[model samples]
Target: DFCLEPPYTGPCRAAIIRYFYNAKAGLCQTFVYGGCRAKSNNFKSAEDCMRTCGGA
Candidate 1:
């Protein structure tokens, strides 16, 4: 299991997204680190990552 250190900041989002889609790569290996799903199954886009990842 991987532990992602956080204060839950935008830099963290940049870091996370960068990991999925590399700075300079074709197809990339995407991975979700550690975060709880939202109460409702309703994540639409990157805007929702914080919401989905925020609720525990």
Candidate 2:
């Protein structure tokens, strides 16, 4: 099984746009990601992330 918890915007500080599953909303939202392999929470984009975790 995978994780259902929220993602982390790590301390790398190298801001980049990436998507994560939404908690309050039933959809994915793109946000800044830092430090490679921070966690499984960060993902490519809306499609894959949403497709994988279809529940809010």
Name the candidate that leads on TM-score.
2
Cα lDDT of model 2 overall? 0.57
Q: On residues 1-56, what C-alpha lDDT tens digit does candidate 1 reach at each position?
A: 11133222132333222222222333222344323431122333444433444333
lDDT of 1 at 43: 34
Per-candidate TM-score against the hidden true structure:
0.22, 0.50
How much is the lDDT of residue 35 in candidate 2? 64
Tens-place lDDT per residue, model 2, 1-56, is 12335555654656666777664666566554666665556567665676666543
Model 1, TM vs. native: 0.22
RMSD, one per candidate, in order = 11.7, 4.1
- Candidate 1 residue spans exceeding 4 A from truth: 1-39, 54-56
Candidate 2 worst ten-residue window by lDDT: 1-10
